[PDB]
Amino acid sequence: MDRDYSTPEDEEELIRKAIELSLKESRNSASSEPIVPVVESKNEVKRQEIEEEEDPDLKAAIQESLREAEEAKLRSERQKA
Length: 81
Fold this sequence. Notes:
Layout: H1 11-24, H2 56-76
């Protein structure tokens, strides 16, 4: 190409190539956005039933039952045995 100051394509070519490439070359972000939530599920299930304890219905039932029986027996008064 030069045809006067010796044709390149040698040491000179390498130097130019290295310089240009080095200057252009750098990091490599190319956009970034990793990490992403994946909580597409929710449940509050859990075993328990640690005994009700002091059942109110039970007490109420006993009282009403004994009272009713008392009234019935009181009215009759008579008993075979």
